[PDB]
Amino acid sequence: NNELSPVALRQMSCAAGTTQTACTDDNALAYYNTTKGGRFVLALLSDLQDLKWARFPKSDGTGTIYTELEPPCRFVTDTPKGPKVKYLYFIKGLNNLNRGMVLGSLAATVRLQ
Amino acid sequence: SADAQSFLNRVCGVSAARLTPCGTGTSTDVVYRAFDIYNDKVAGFAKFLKTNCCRFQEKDEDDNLIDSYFVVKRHTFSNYQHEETIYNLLKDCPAVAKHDFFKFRIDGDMVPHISRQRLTKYTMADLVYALRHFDEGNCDTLKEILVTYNCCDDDYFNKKDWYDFVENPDILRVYANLGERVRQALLKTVQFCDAMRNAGIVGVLTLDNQDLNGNWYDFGDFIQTTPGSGVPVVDSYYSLLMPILTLTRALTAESHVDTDLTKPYIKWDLLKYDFTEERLKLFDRYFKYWDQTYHPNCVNCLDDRCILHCA
Numbered sequence: 001n002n003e004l005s006p007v008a009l010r011q012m013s014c015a016a017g018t019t020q021t022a023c024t025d026d027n028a029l030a031y032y033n034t035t036k037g038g039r040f041v042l043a044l045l046s047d048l049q050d051l052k053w054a055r056f057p058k059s060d061g062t063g064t065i066y067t068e069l070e071p072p073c074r075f076v077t078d079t080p081k082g083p084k085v086k087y088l089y090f091i092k093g094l095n096n097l098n099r100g101m102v103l104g105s106l107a108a109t110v111r112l113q
Numbered sequence: 114s115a116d117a118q119s120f121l122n123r124v125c126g127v128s129a130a131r132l133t134p135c136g137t138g139t140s141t142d143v144v145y146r147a148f149d150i151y152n153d154k155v156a157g158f159a160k161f162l163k164t165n166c167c168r169f170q171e172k173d174e175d176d177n178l179i180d181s182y183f184v185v186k187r188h189t190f191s192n193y194q195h196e197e198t199i200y201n202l203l204k205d206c207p208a209v210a211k212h213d214f215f216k217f218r219i220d221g222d223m224v225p226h227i228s229r230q231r232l233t234k235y236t237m238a239d240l241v242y243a244l245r246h247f248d249e250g251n252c253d254t255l256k257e258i259l260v261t262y263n264c265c266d267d268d269y270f271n272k273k274d275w276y277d278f279v280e281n282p283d284i285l286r287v288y289a290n291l292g293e294r295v296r297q298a299l300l301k302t303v304q305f306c307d308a309m310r311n312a313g314i315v316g317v318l319t320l321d322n323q324d325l326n327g328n329w330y331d332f333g334d335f336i337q338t339t340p341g342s343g344v345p346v347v348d349s350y351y352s353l354l355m356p357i358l359t360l361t362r363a364l365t366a367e368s369h370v371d372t373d374l375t376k377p378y379i380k381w382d383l384l385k386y387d388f389t390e391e392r393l394k395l396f397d398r399y400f401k402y403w404d405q406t407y408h409p410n411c412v413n414c415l416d417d418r419c420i421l422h423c424a
């Protein structure tokens with residue numbers, strides 16, 4: 001019985017960027033893993049369909065960093081309230097284990113068809 | 114009675130399958146087998162004891178017992194609907210063992226059964242545990258995988274020091290006869306991982322769910338996503354298997370002219386020394402879903418923990 005993420009994750013907050021340049025103050029959303037280490041967000045989502053890099057804020061003072069993305073995969077991601085399209089880019093350089101925990105949490109515990 | 118011989122007739126079906134019971138009636142069968150566990154309570158690669166499975170062997174027309182076992186499993190009812198909505202998607206891959214889901218009258222209820230058709234007696238985790246935890250006074254599981262697959266005979270274990278590499282160097286030839294059973298169970302993992310990605314299934318691949326033919330069979334801890342994005346997690350399957358890929362000399366059919374163990378050897382150019390485009394094609398054929406950069410020439414590596422990985 002090898003189970004993926006036998007304990008769930010939490011946290012959703014802050015922003016990221018859409019224009020490598022812009023990321024003015026509020027672009028897209030970051031998802032999960034405060035990450036014991038400190039802060040390591042596993043995955044990213046968006047209400048839009050245009051995001052090249054993302055200056056996602058982080059702890060300390062040098063929190064600014066280019067948390068860029070890669071070719072996405074979109075889902076219907078039906079909100080309980082109603083339908084809403086959301087394109088899921090993954091953090092550049094994620095490994096197959098983390099993309100398993102993320103997918104397991106936001107699909108099996110959320111309303112997706 | 115007739116409530117026992119009816120089970121032997123419902124386990125069968127469209128196939129011929131002249132089965133013989135092994136669990137004394139409609140009861141299960143207890144075995145001691147190797148497993149790879151991780152479930153918030155336990156973790157490790159250890160020999161545990163199984164109790165939820167009834168085994169039925171199979172005899173051919175000449176009425177001789179062959180290597181074919183139907184392993185019907187009793188479990189909860191929410192597993193039944195979940196291992197049938199993931200099997201109905203991964204049923205067209207030729208590297209998946211046939212399943213049969215039904216409901217039977219045990220005593221006073223309708224209890225559900227899941228039957229896997231034509232497995233082998235042992236898994237790939239039983240063969241890996243046997244060669245990595247060797248005891249020369251407790252090696253019954255290894256002296257059977259070696260005789261069932263015509264690697265040696267039962268009179269080979271009578272000579273003393275038959276397990277020794279320095280006194281009997283002929284044991285490296287009895288081990289090398291498992292190299293094509295292991296090489297063909299490496300090509301079926303890459304088919305299963307491809308079929309598991311096109312359908313949207315996410316799950317961890319462990320070696321006790323692939324019998325000694327390459328067929329896969331527990332789909333009870335897998336989740337479902339949108340098709341096209343599936344993530345086979347193969348990291349304790351390849352790593353635990355690695356020491357057996359050179360002991361059994363698995364990739365000795367790659368030296369032949371069509372990867373055929375019958376056709377003659379490949380005659381290479383004598384002035385050739387690079388072999389980088391064939392090193393990157395051997396990684397793609399057998400280790401396709403191993404997610405980490407592989408540098409054939411370790412002069413392009415990134416630290417001393419990458420040199421050790423890529424060498």
Ligand SMILES: Nc1nc2c(ncn2[C@@H]2O[C@H](COP(=O)(O)OP(=O)(O)O)[C@@H](O)[C@H]2O)c(=O)[nH]1
Nearest residue numbers: 144146182232233234235236321322324330331
């Ligand atoms: N291949 C095979 N496996 C067997 C047999 N008898 C018992 N087993 C064990 O049964 C297990 C099958 O796993 P399964 O029942 O699908 O999953 P589980 O109930 O969640 O462990 C294998 O891991 C073996 O260790 C047999 O005849 N053939």
Ligand code: BEF
Nearest residue numbers: 001331332333334
């Ligand atoms: F919990 Be078993 F791997 F179907």
Ligand SMILES: [Mg+2]
Nearest residue numbers: 001321322331
């Ligand atoms: Mg299992």
Ligand SMILES: [Zn+2]
Nearest residue numbers: 408414419423
């Ligand atoms: Zn390297």
